[PDB]
């Protein structure tokens, strides 16, 4: 096994390794005990959490550092994501309207902030996601 503890205290753990460009098990633990699970294949680490038909995918190292993807297998009211590297922000949309931003802070926490009804501008304040259950709710 191989365990990496980041400066900010968050960790990445690889297990059941085969050649160390590929590992069958990979666990990332961010602040507030938000854990995502996945694997390492072809030197890229993919970690994820599922909620219903939605999958939040977090990919690490790909000549681009970190990429966050959203995948939704539902037909109607499908969520899609747009990742902004320079701001570490995942914008989630339901059909043609933006609905919220998820910001992954350098300190390892995650905030959520909603868009207005038109899906064009942010409103209110950003609030910290306190655990996995709250992250999953933001995917509903």
Question: What does the model show?
Answer:
This is Outer surface protein B. It is found in: Cell outer membrane. The chain has one helix at 132-138, and strands at 2-5, 11-17, 23-30, 34-41, 44-51, 54-60, 66-72, 79-84, 89-94, 97-104, 110-114, 127-128. The termini are far apart. It has one domain: Alpha-Beta Complex (Outer Surface Protein A, domain 3), CATH 3.90.930.1. With 140 residues, the chain is mainly beta. The strands form 2 sheets. Strands 1-2-3-4-5-6-7 form a 7-stranded antiparallel β-sheet, with helices on one face. Strands 8-9-10-11-12 form a 5-stranded antiparallel β-sheet, with no helix packed on it.
**If strands are numbered along the chain, what order do they take across the biggest sheet?**
1-2-3-4-5-6-7
Q: Quick one: biggest sheet?
A: 7 strands, antiparallel
Q: Would you identify the CATH architecture?
A: Alpha-Beta Complex
Strand content: over 45%
Q: What is the CA-CA span between the terminal residues?
A: 34 Å
Shape: globular
PDB class: membrane protein
Keywords: intermolecular beta sheet, extended beta sheet, membrane protein
Assembly: monomeric
Entry title: Outer Surface Protein B of B. burgdorferi: crystal structure of the C-terminal fragment
């Amino acid at each position: 096994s191989k365990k990496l503890t980041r400066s900010n205290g968050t960790t990445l753990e690889y297990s059941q390794i085969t050649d160390a460009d590929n590992a069958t098990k990979a666990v990332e633990t961010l602040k507030n005990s938000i854990k995502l699970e996945g694997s390492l294949v072809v030197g890229k680490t993919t970690v994820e959490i599922k909620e219903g038909t939605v999958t939040l995918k977090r990919e690490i190292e790909k000549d681009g550092k970190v990429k966050v993807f959203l995948n939704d297998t539902a037909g109607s009211n499908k969520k899609t994501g747009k990742w902004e590297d320079s701001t570490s922000t995942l914008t989630i949309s339901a059909d043609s309207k933006k609905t919220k931003d998820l910001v992954f802070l350098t300190d390892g926490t995650i905030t959520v902030q909603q868009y207005n009804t038109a899906g064009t501008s942010l409103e209110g304040s950003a609030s910290e996601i306190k655990n996995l259950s709250e992250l999953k709710n933001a995917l509903k």
